[PDB]
Specification:
This is part of a larger assembly, with two copies of chain A, three copies of chain B and one copy of chain F.
Chain A (H helix, E strand, L loop, with lengths): L1 H15 L1 H9 L10 H17 L11 H9 L12 E4 L6 H11 L4 E4 L14 H9 L2 E2 L6 E2 L23 H6 L1 H7 L1
Parallel strand pairs in A: 1-2
Antiparallel strand pairs in A: 3-4
Helix pairs in contact in A: 2-3, 4-5
Chain B lengths: L36 H13 L8 H11 L6 H13 L17 E11 L5 H11 L16 E13 L2 E8 L12 H11 L2 H18 L5 H4 E8 L12 E4 L5 H10 L1
Parallel strand pairs in B: 3-4
Antiparallel strand pairs in B: 1-2, 2-3, 4-5
Chain F lengths: L1 H4 L3 H10 L5 H16 L4 E2 H6 L4 H7 L9 H7 L3 E2 L7 E3 L3 E4 H15 L9 H11 L8 H11 L3 E4 L6 H15 L7 E5 L2 H15 L16 E3 H4 L21 E4 L7 H9 L6 E6 L12 H6 L8 H11 L12 H6 L14 H9 L3 H9 L6 E4 L4 H14 L1 H8 L4 H8 L2 E5 L8 H14 L16 E3 L14 E6 L4 E6 L5 E4 L8 E2 L2 E3 L8 E7 L10 H9 L1 E8 L2 H9 L8 H4 L3
Parallel strand pairs in F: 2-3, 5-9, 6-7, 6-8, 8-9, 10-19, 11-17, 11-18, 18-19
Antiparallel strand pairs in F: 1-4, 3-4, 12-13, 12-16, 13-14, 14-15
The chains are: A mainly alpha, B alpha+beta, F alpha/beta.
Family (chain A): Belongs to the RecC family.
Protein name (chain A): RecBCD enzyme subunit RecC
Subunit structure (chain A): Heterotrimer of RecB, RecC and RecD. All subunits contribute to DNA-binding. Interacts with YgbT (Cas1).
Chain lengths: 187, 262, 142, 684, 148, 597
């Protein structure tokens, strides 16, 4: 039972938190984590040695994504075998690692992302006022009308909607109470 | 006080259902193979997973028999039988399966076919019998008016010298152990199991697929025929036994497309 | 991390009580099993007696028996305690020196005859009621 | 079309394989083996049919098989070796019954079982073929084995205990696939240490029930499915069920030692936020109509069950965002409550309520409950009806005895042939520690029939101990000693006045009615009957009928019956005229009981009569104290206490009336005064 | 008694060939027939043939559609629910019949065989153990009663 | 035998449980005894155990005692499982034959009943001779029915051995008429017993049509036997328990008991019937000597009637000559005068003579196989046909001959006539098969006949209905509520009210039952020879399997021959027919030694 729960936690770390496993492979702790890391950091590294002791391959999901991004940004010619266009439809939840890989994939091959959002304006959070100006400079355009449309309803009063920490005061309480996953995904 | 109950005036719904073709219907030898649904699906998965360009390895067949759970004594006869299947060409020109590259082949193509009209069996069986010569016998099946979608799973689609071809796998073949699986016995099996409707729907789906995918498409120019491969009927000395090549009249497909469209 | 909660616990409790009655009451001899049968007919009566103590917090028993005392040792101790009184009755028999009172009837010698036939064997467990006539606190009040 | 349900393919294959994986941990109870033999695969493996299973049910029930496959299994559980009430004891008993009759006696302190005697005991040779196999794997699956040795174990178990069939082929294929997948995932890490059996059993039981089906999600029939995340499809009508509190949102507690729950990031996913986004997508995806139903009132105690927080926020936003045109300007909170009450449709508790069929906003479409709600049906008429019945010429004495044993039962099971057949009792789980009920009565009857001939009580004790019906060891000896004391006390009164008498013939002609029968054990002193029962009125009625049929043709003498606790029924000899008159009265009662149900209760009516009768003056008392004590005795004998089953608790009396009305009570009193009066008139 | 009547009805549905079980199930208080009706049913062979045919149809519904459809077709064709609602004191019996039907439908989905549900019902009749779901409910709520 | 080598698990578990820690000789002896009890042999001779076992020297090396246990009797008596008849042991060895305790007890009970209790009831010979003269009109030559009735009314226990078609029921009617005319003032409660319900119904209808012919009186018609009961119903057998109502204490209050068809009475049923009889009832047994053996283990009627071939006694011959008034021959020698006197042999068959080949074939069945080949060979008597069945073309020829046999049935079926003539035409032709499954059996021949009726345009059959018009069904279990017994045929047809099954009652009427009202139903285009006993068919056709089986023996072919009235066809090989006659189903029992002393 302990092995199954620790394997599920290690799979969640392989999906979501690759930096923690990358630092645990060397043997150094991460400042600001819980007490369970005191038994989770040596448990992972001795795992990486154990598959290093056997004939199994070394490569996994966590250590490969940075090299995959770099080998696509550093290449000059397109590699053969890649598809012409990839559609992402009906998907409203993805990790930032998958989006950072799909951005480097989309620099070469056109990828169409069909995302269903219930609101037409920006209803996510903000990071910095320098990021608020970057979001204000970005404007959408219609597929058939071909007219430029802004994100916020008011551009001069867009700074008053966000709080000091960066959370937008959503006027609709149902969207603010139920759509936290979409609120993170649109950000 | 007086009280009454409301009564529904009409039927709640028409016959809308997304169905398939099945809804509308010495000591070691392949003849001595156990005939069943599970060995048929095992041979279908063996022909799906195996690569056609590379030669068949006996240890891979032994590992696949370990994963499936069959006897280990059958393995050295099965692999040479598999290569005997792979050495036998299935074409009107003599094209083998080893000449097909990975980009040319496509295994287990799943298609959905729409139909907006109520499918009348009397208006369809007569249209089949007007052009198909195998419908001389075979009294017509009875099915309800099916309006909606139709599912299908084609085993293999492959192109060669600029011509597309279809390939399906039938491997039950319980009643034959000798070399009697000639073209007459295969035609009788096609008339008995009613695989003519399945092959006609496969030709219609492939025609619609090649029309949607390839621009400037012609049915006579690109399509070549449909091949049925009976696995237990393939012999090394008999190239014609085991394979069954059929080409439509190129006039039934347009009328069937007009019937399924509206 | 995962466990299965059960709603009814009476079946396993009755099974453990039957196992205790099998491993404790079966190899007893006749002179002990007679008293065990006089106490309870079977394990169902014992479970009906101790069902209010088996569930919940286990209570503390006042003056518990020692861990080495079995049923046979207690039976032999009570048999010797009865046999000492039987010997003291057999030694001091054949005399009457107490004064006859108005409450005390003169049939007490017949009760002594009932105590004369009582001392035959120590296979029984229940003494006679006529020993209640031989109490100094009851004879003094009479 | 129902989708997202758990895939249930073959329960009696997977559950039987799971029970076979718990074979050493099982106690081998007889019910668990008859449940394993209920599976047609395990029964067809050992050549057992359904008729053979039906014979084996009663064979195991009567042969004394309760628990324990072998004596070594009894010694394994730290229990004393009793030697009886095991599977080996029952097998030896059935084989000795196949070899030797039960009248011969014991051979190895095992009484034979006289039922299985012919070729049908060959099925016993099938059952002994099963449990022996159930021994071998019990010694096989106990030892711990490494993962390289658990490969052929499930395959050998499948080819040993189960037979391949057309239906159950896919279940065995899935069992082999899951077992080999578990062993392949174990050997991919190259596990070297030993692995116990229970871990693999729990893993296979968890992996076998994990499969789901979602093939018919959008086939065309209406879709029944659970809320699945990241799946939002636009529909015209969207209905929601089970939106009460606690059920939704589905809460999954974290592991506690996970570090992702401590420091949350942007891309972290939780089930609560996924369920809230699913509710938002269900609100957005609804195009035309949205239906929401939740359990609001409890079905047990009628307690108020609050809905979920999402539906409460939805109805709060509805009440704060909209208002009815009836109250245009009344208030803010009152209009919100009026909107929330107008939207809330509190349906009725029962479907046959007339409120649902009232015309208005909502109306039910169930026309099957419309006449139930209309209250236009006929009531249940009385079961008692006057039937035509002609008294035949030759009415035997056995028919009169079966009539006067129970008149309502003789009216039910003989006139209209309605016999309420109850199912037989199940096999108990343990050996009999005490003796009570039918077994104690049969033991007392056989002991009284043995002591009436001055036979050896110890031989019958060994005979009853060899069959396992007695408790083990000293307690069975104590029970046999006290029952022998009671039966000797009864026999000292029984054989004090016993004379050798033979059975005689009875051929009578009374009122043009012929009575043919036989009376057993007719002594020159009269009639002598003995039964180890209590003082009851039914045995007195039987003895009075036998005395009437004996005194009518000669036979001057008394009739005596001896019960327990010094109970005695005595009838003096009477003349031929009074006996023929009372026999004609009983024949008239029989012909009245065949046309109409003769409400003559023997026990309660006899108790009422013996409370009201006075044998000194041959007259019935009429004071209020006796009239109240007779009602008390009638209510005591009709409905008994919580330890004695009363006369009113019967399947023949509940059919006529459900509650004992005083009118039917007075009718029963009058019928008992008319018929049961010569019972207490000639009693001495 | 309603559980025993439902057991007799299920035994008559499962085995309608033997007339003894069907006669014992027809004479119950759930059907509500007089002694003259039972006598004319025993005398007329054609009415008993119609009863056997409709019980075979009930067995076909029970094998194809389940427990509650068979019970609803039996309560609608015989119209016993209206007769129990018309009889004074029969509403509690009808609610007990409906609860027994709901429990039989809840226990019939977890069992594959048809005789296994009959054995489960006979076992739960023989087992008086009290569960939270298998307790008696309130018979009526509209009519005011003295609450002990 | 072949089946005797393949040990049942019952015999193996019995040998492992009874012997246990004893010598393996006792284990092998218990296994062989249990296998012979399962096959039907009552006793086990020690010569077959000593000679026909390869492990006999090995067990001779297994035992180690002072006397080395060289004899099998000492080796068996050394164990606690075998005794001489005193100790309560499962196995009993008395006359160098090992049996079980129940079989030995029942065999000694039967020997006591047939050796000691059978005394001679002395009655008036003049009135008996006058009643025999006034009942039997033939007094010119020797009539076996008159001698059978005289020897049944003379003694208490009497066995009447006779084949079918010999006028047995007329002899029973004459016996009962002379019994009532002899005892006028004495009341006689005559009772009739049968092993099966169908044979009981046939006995009731036969005695009903026989007793109304003879002239009686108003008090004599009152003492007519009302009905024939089953032996499990007469003794009061229960479904749950095996306890009888008249087991040992109270006997059945009967004066005379006529038990028909004693060939189907096994040893335990005979022993249960013996213990129920009082010390004054007179029992008359009916049945054929050469008929098929009993169902369970035992052979009562054959071991009883084996001594009928010796003849009567010297005093009994003069007694029968004084009774019948004719010249009765005497039997040579005297071994058991009571049993040889109580027996009788019926040889004059009235429904068939020497001109018909059925009686000649039945007489040649008990003789050698060459006699049967000669009986079939010369001119066939226009009654018996022989068709060779080896390959598929012979199977098609057999199906064509079955079509020619069922031609009138299909002609009356297609013409939409009354069902009574349809049943009367179906009861004229019948196939008799040995096994149940396979290509040669009940369900195989039934499915092949249904496929042949589907091929040729004779019977229209729906594949999913299973109740097409014209299918013959038969019931497997008894049902007294519907009036149909086990072994009764019904024909499903449409009279206009729906598809219902018509049954031909023995009273002469027809009953139309719903197919949903049938408790059991199996297709009966070909019946088994064991299940066709008691019935009679005009045109029978035997089909024997090519596989060698112990079921096909002399008694099976004899019951297949006597089942036909006039015409009989055969579909078998010559070697199987030659081997079935020589291989007689012998059952080893202790009655041959107990009746000899």
């Amino acid at each position: 039972q302990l092995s199954s729960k620790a394997a599920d936690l290690f799979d969640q770390y392989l999906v979501y938190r690759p930096d923690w496993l990358a630092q645990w492979e060397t043997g150094h702790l991460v400042e600001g984590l819980g007490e369970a890391q005191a038994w989770q950091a040596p448990l992972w590294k001795a795992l990486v040695e154990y598959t290093h002791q056997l004939g199994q391959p070394r490569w996994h999901r966590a250590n490969l994504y940075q090299r995959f991004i770099e080998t696509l940004e550093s290449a000059t010619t397109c590699p053969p075998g890649l598809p012409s266009r990839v559609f992402i439809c009906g998907i409203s939840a993805l990790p930032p690692v998958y989006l950072q890989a799909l951005q480097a994939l989309g620099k070469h091959i056109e990828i169409h992302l069909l995302f269903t959002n219930p609101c037409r304006y920006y209803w996510g959070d903000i990071k910095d006022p320098a990021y608020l100006a970057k979001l204000l400079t970005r404007q959408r355009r219609h597929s058939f009308e071909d007219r430029e449309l802004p994100l916020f309803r008011d551009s001069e009063n867009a700074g008053q909607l966000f709080n000091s920490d960066g959370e937008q005061d959503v006027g609709n309480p149902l969207l603010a109470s139920w759509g936290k996953l979409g609120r993170d995904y649109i950000y | 006080a007086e009280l009454n109950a409301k009564t529904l005036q009409r039927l709640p719904g028409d016959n809308w259902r997304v169905t398939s073709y099945s809804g509308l219907q010495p000591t070691l030898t392949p003849h001595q193979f156990p005939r069943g649904a599970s060995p048929g699906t095992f041979l279908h998965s063996l022909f799906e997973d195996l690569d056609f360009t590379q030669p068949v390895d006996p240890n891979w067949v032994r590992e696949k028999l370990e994963l499936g759970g069959f006897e280990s004594q059958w393995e050295p006869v099965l692999t040479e039988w598999i290569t005997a299947v792979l050495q036998a060409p299935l074409n009107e020109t003599g094209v083998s399966l080893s000449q097909l590259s990975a980009r040319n082949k496509q295994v287990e193509m799943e298609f959905y076919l729409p139909i907006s009209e109520p499918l009348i069996a009397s208006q369809l069986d007569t249209l089949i019998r007007q052009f198909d010569p195998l419908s001389a016998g075979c009294p017509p099946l009875e099915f309800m008016q099916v309006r909606g979608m139709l599912k299908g799973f084609i085993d293999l689609v492959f192109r060669h010298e600029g011509r597309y071809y279809l390939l399906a796998y039938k491997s039950n073949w319980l009643g034959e152990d000798s070399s009697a699986y000639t073209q007459q016995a295969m035609a009788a099996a096609m008339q008995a199991h009613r695989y003519d409707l399945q092959y006609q729907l496969y030709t219609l789906a492939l025609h619609r697929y090649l029309r949607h995918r390839i621009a400037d498409y012609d049915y006579e120019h690109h399509f070549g025929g449909v091949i049925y491969l009976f696995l237990r009927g393939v012999d090394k000395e008999h190239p014609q036994q085991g394979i069954y090549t059929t080409r439509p009249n190129a006039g039934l497909i347009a009328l069937m497309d007009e019937m399924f469209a509206g | 991390f995962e466990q299965q909660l059960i709603e009814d616990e009476s079946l396993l409790r009755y099974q453990a009580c039957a196992d205790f009655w099998r491993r404790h009451c079966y190899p007893l001899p006749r002179e002990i099993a007679q008293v065990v049968f006089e106490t309870w007919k079977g394990p169902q009566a014992l479970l009906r007696d101790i069902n209010r103590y088996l569930q919940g917090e286990a209570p503390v028993i006042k003056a518990p028996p020692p861990d080495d005392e079995t049923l046979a040792s207690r039976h032999a101790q009570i048999v010797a305690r009865i046999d000492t009184v039987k010997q003291q009755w057999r030694d001091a028999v054949g005399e009457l020196d107490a004064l006859i009172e108005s409450s005390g009837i003169d049939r007490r010698k017949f009760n002594r005859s009932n105590q004369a036939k009582w001392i035959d064997k120590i296979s029984a467990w229940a003494e006679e009621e006529t020993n209640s006539y031989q109490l100094p606190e009851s004879l003094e009040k009479f | 079309a129902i989708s997202d349900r758990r895939a249930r393919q073959s329960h009696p294959v997977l559950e039987a394989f799971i029970s076979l994986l718990s074979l050493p941990d099982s106690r081998f109870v007889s019910e668990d083996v008859l449940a394993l033999l209920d599976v047609p695969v395990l029964a067809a493996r050992f050549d057992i049919t359904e008729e053979g299973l039906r014979y084996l049910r009663q064979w195991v029930n009567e042969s004394g098989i309760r628990w324990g496959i072998d004596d070594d299994n009894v010694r394994e559980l730290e229990l004393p070796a009793t030697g009886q009430h095991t599977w080996r004891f029952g097998l030896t008993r059935m084989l000795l019954g196949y070899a030797m009759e039960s009248a011969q006696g014991e051979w190895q302190s095992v009484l034979p079982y006289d039922e299985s005697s012919g070729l049908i005991a060959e099925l016993v040779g099938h059952l002994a073929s099963l449990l022996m196999q159930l021994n071998i794997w019990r010694r096989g699956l106990a030892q711990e084995r490494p993962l390289e040795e658990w490969l052929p174990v499930c395959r050998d178990m499948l080819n040993a205990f189960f037979l391949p069939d057309a239906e159950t082929e896919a279940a065995m294929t899935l069992i082999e696939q899951q077992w080999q997948a578990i062993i392949a995932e174990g050997l991919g890490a190259q596990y070297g240490d030993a692995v116990p059996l229970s871990l693999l059993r729990d893993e296979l039981a968890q992996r076998l029930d994990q499969e789901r089906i979602s093939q018919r999600f959008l086939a065309g029939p209406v879709n029944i499915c659970t809320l699945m995340p990241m799946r939002s499809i636009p529909f015209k009508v969207v209905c929601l069920l089970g939106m009460n509190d606690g059920v939704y949102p589905r809460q999954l507690a974290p592991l506690g030692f996970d570090l992702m729950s401590q420091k949350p990031k942007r891309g972290d996913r939780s089930r609560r936020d996924d369920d809230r986004y699913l509710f938002l997508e269900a609100l957005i995806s609804a195009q035309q109509k949205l239906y929401i139903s939740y359990i609001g009132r409890s079905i047990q105690d009628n307690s108020e069950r609050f809905p979920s927080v999402l539906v409460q926020e939805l109805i709060d936003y509805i009440g704060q965002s909209h208002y009815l045109p009836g109250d245009e300007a009344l208030n803010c909170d009152e209009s919100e409550a009026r909107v929330k009450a107008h939207l809330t449709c509190l349906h009725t508790r029962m479907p046959f309520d007339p409120q649902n069929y009232q015309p208005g906003e909502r109306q039910s479409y169930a026309r099957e409950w419309l006449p139930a709600a209309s209250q236009a049906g006929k009531a249940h008429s009385e079961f008692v009806q006057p039937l035509p019945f002609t008294l035949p010429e030759t009415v035997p004495l056995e028919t009169l005895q079966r009539f006067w044993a129970h008149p309502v039962r003789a009216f039910f099971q003989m006139r209209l042939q309605v016999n309420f057949r109850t199912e037989d009792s199940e096999i108990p789980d343990t050996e009999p520690f005490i003796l009570e009920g039918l077994s104690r009565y049969q033991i007392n009857q056989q002991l009284l029939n043995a002591l009436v001939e001055q036979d050896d009580a110890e031989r019958l004790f060994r005979r009853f101990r060899a069959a396992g019906d007695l408790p083990y060891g000293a307690f069975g000896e104590i029970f046999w000693e006290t029952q022998c004391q009671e039966m000797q006390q009864l026999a000292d009164r029984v054989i004090a006045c016993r004379q050798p008498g033979q059975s005689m013939e009875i051929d009578l002609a009374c009122n043009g009615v012929q009575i043919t029968g036989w009376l057993p054990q007719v002594q020159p002193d009269g009639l002598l009957r003995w039964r180890p029962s209590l003082l009851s009125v039914a045995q007195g009625m039987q003895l009075w009928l036998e005395h009437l049929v004996y005194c009518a043709s000669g036979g001057n003498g008394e009739s005596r019956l001896f019960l327990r606790k010094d109970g005695e029924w005595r009838f003096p000899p009477l003349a031929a005229e009074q006996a023929l008159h009372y026999l004609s009265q009983l024949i008239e009662g029989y012909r009245e009981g065949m046309s109409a149900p003769l409400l003559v209760l023997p026990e309660s009516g006899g108790a009422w009569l013996k409370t009201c009768y006075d044998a000194q003056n041959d007259a019935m008392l009429d004071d209020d104290s006796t009239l109240q004590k007779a009602r008390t005795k009638f209510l005591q004998a009709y409905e008994g206490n919580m330890m004695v089953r009363g006369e009113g608790d019967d399947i023949w009396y509940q059919r006529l009336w459900r509650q004992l009305t005083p009118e039917t009570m007075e009718a029963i009193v009058e019928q008992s005064q008319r018929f049961l009066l010569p019972l207490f008139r000639f009693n001495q | 008694l309603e559980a025993q009547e439902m057991l007799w009805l299920l035994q008559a549905v499962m085995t309608p060939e033997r007339e003894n079980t069907l006669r014992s199930a027809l004479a119950t208080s759930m059907m509500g027939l007089n002694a003259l009706d039972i006598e004319t049913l025993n005398n007329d062979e054609h009415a008993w043939d119609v009863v056997v045919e409709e019980f075979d149809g009930y067995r076909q519904i029970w094998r194809k559609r389940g427990v509650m459809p068979m019970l609803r077709a039996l309560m609608s064709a015989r119209n016993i629910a209206e007769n129990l609602l018309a009889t004074a004191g029969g509403e509690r019996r009808l609610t007990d019949i409906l609860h027994i039907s709901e429990l039989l439908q809840e226990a019939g989905t977890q069992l594959e065989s048809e005789h296994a549900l009959v054995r489960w019902l006979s076992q739960h009749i023989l087992e008086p153990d009290s569960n939270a779901s298998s307790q008696q409910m309130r018979l009526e709520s509209d009519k005011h009663l003295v609450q002990i | 035998a072949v089946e005797h080598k393949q040990l049942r698990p019952l015999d193996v578990q019995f040998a492992l449980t009874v012997a246990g820690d004893e010598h393996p000789a006792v284990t092998l002896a218990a296994a062989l005894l249990s296998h012979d009890a399962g096959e039907g042999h009552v006793c086990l001779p020690l010569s077959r155990l000593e000679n026909n076992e390869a492990s006999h020297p090995l067990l001779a090396t297994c035992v180690s005692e002072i006397g080395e246990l060289q004899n099998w009797e000492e080796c068996l008596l050394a164990s606690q499982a075998v005794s001489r008849g005193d100790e309560p042991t499962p196995m009993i060895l008395c006359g160098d034959r090992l049996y079980l305790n129940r079989m030995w007890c029942n065999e000694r009970t039967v020997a006591r009943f047939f050796n000691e209790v059978n005394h001679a009831i002395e009655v008036d010979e003049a009135l008996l001779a006058q009643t025999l003269d006034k009942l039997f009109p033939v007094s010119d030559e020797i009539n076996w029915q008159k001698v059978a009735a005289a020897v049944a009314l003379t003694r208490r226990i009497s066995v009447i051995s006779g084949g079918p078609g010999t006028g047995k029921t007329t002899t029973v009617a004459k016996l009962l008429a002379a019994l009532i005319q002899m005892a006028d003032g004495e009341r006689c409660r005559i009772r009739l017993a049968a092993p099966t319900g169908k044979a009981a119904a046939r006995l009731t209808e036969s005695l009903g049509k026989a007793l109304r012919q003879l002239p009686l009186t108003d008090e004599q018609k009152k003492r007519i036997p009302e009905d024939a009961s089953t032996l499990h119903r007469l003794l009061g057998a229960q479904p749950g328990s095996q306890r009888l109502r008249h087991h040992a204490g109270n006997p059945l209050h009967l004066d005379v008991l006529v038990v028909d068809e004693a060939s189907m009475i096994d040893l335990p049923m005979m022993s249960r019937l013996i213990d129920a009889l009082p010390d004054h009832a007179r029992v008359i047994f009916l049945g054929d000597r050469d008929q098929l053996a009993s169902v369970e283990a035992g052979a009562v009627l054959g071991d009883i009637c084996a001594y009928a071939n010796a003849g009567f006694t010297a005093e009994r011959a003069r007694q029968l000559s004084r009774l019948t008034g004719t010249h009765v021959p005497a039997g040579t020698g005297t071994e058991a005068a009571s049993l040889r006197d109580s027996l009788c042999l019926l040889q004059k068959s009235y429904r068939f003579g020497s001109d018909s080949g059925i009686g000649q074939l039945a007489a040649a069945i008990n003789r050698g196989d060459k006699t049967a080949v000669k009986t079939v060979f010369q001119q066939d008597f226009t009654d018996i046909e022989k068709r060779l069945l080896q390959s598929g073309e012979d199977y098609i020829a057999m199906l064509e001959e079955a079509l020619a046999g069922y031609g009138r049935y299909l002609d009356l079926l297609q013409a939409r006539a009354e069902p009574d003539l349809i049943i009367q035409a179906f009861n004229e032709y019948q196939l008799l098969c040995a096994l149940r499954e396979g290509p040669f059996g009940v369900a195989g021949l039934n499915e092949r006949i249904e496929q042949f009726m589907q091929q040729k345009r004779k019977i229209h059959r729906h594949p999913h209905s299973r109740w097409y018009e014209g299918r013959p069904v038969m019931i497997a279990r008894n049902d007294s509520a519907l009036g149909l017994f086990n072994g009764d045929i019904g024909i499903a047809l449409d009279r206009g009210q729906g598809t219902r099954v018509w049954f031909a009652m023995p009273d002469g009427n027809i009953k139309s039952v719903q197919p949903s009202r049938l408790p059991e139903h199996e297709t009966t285009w070909a019946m088994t020879v064991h299940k066709s006993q008691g019935s009679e068919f005009d045109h029978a056709a035997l089909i024997l399997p090519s596989q060698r089986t112990p079921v096909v023996t002399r008694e099976l072919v004899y019951t297949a021959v006597t089942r036909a009235r006039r015409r009989l066809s055969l579909y078998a090989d010559e070697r199987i027919l030659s081997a079935a006659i020589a291989t007689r189903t012998e059952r080893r029992s202790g009655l041959a030694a107990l009746f000899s002393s």
